[PDB]
Ligand binder design. Structure first.
Ligand SMILES: COc1ccc(CCc2nc3cc(-c4c(C)noc4C)ccc3n2C[C@H](C)N2CCOCC2)cc1Cl
Length: 118
């Protein structure tokens, strides 16, 4: 599929929005530094690169993920969200457990979208 015309941006953005779960206490909804702006110095030392679901839904509408055949770019942004949460909060916290659960749920929804759309 060398000439894949890309996934519909609105469709990808609705997929990203559906990854924001109440069972995850919405911890991935918005930038950590929008919620905790004074954490910036401490958080950036550990996590130089950040992402969140509101930023990803915005990037989806700009077409940031549309041209990856298997939405590899979106999967990398989900992995970053999850990884930063494990790294900043520690592997024994309930946050790290929520990050691992969210990641597994998100990759399954991404794969089901790819399979459905194609
Ligand atoms: C895993 O168990 C929980 C998870 C989260 C909480 C506390 C809430 C929380 N604890 C949070 C921790 C983070 C966070 C931090 C700090 N570093 O990475 C992440 C991700 C980010 C958001 C967090 N949020 C949600 C923030 C307060 N909200 C803003 C308003 O809209 C709803 C969401 C409590 C529990 Cl019991």
């Amino acid at each position: 599929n060398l000439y894949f015309q890309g996934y519909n941006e609105a469709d990808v953005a609705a997929l990203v929005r559906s990854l924001d779960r109440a069972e995850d206490h919405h911890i991935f909804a918005v930038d950590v530094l929008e919620t905790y702006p004074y954490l910036a110095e401490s958080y950036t030392k550990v996590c130089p690169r950040r992402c969140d679901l509101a930023t990803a839904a915005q990037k989806a509408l700009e077409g940031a993920y549309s041209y990856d055949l298997r939405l590899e770019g979106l999967k990398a942004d989900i992995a970053l969200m999850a990884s930063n949460c494990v790294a900043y909060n520690g592997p024994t916290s309930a946050y790290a457990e929520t990050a691992a659960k969210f990641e597994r749920y998100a990759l399954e929804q991404i794969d089901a979208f790819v399979l459905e759309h194609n």
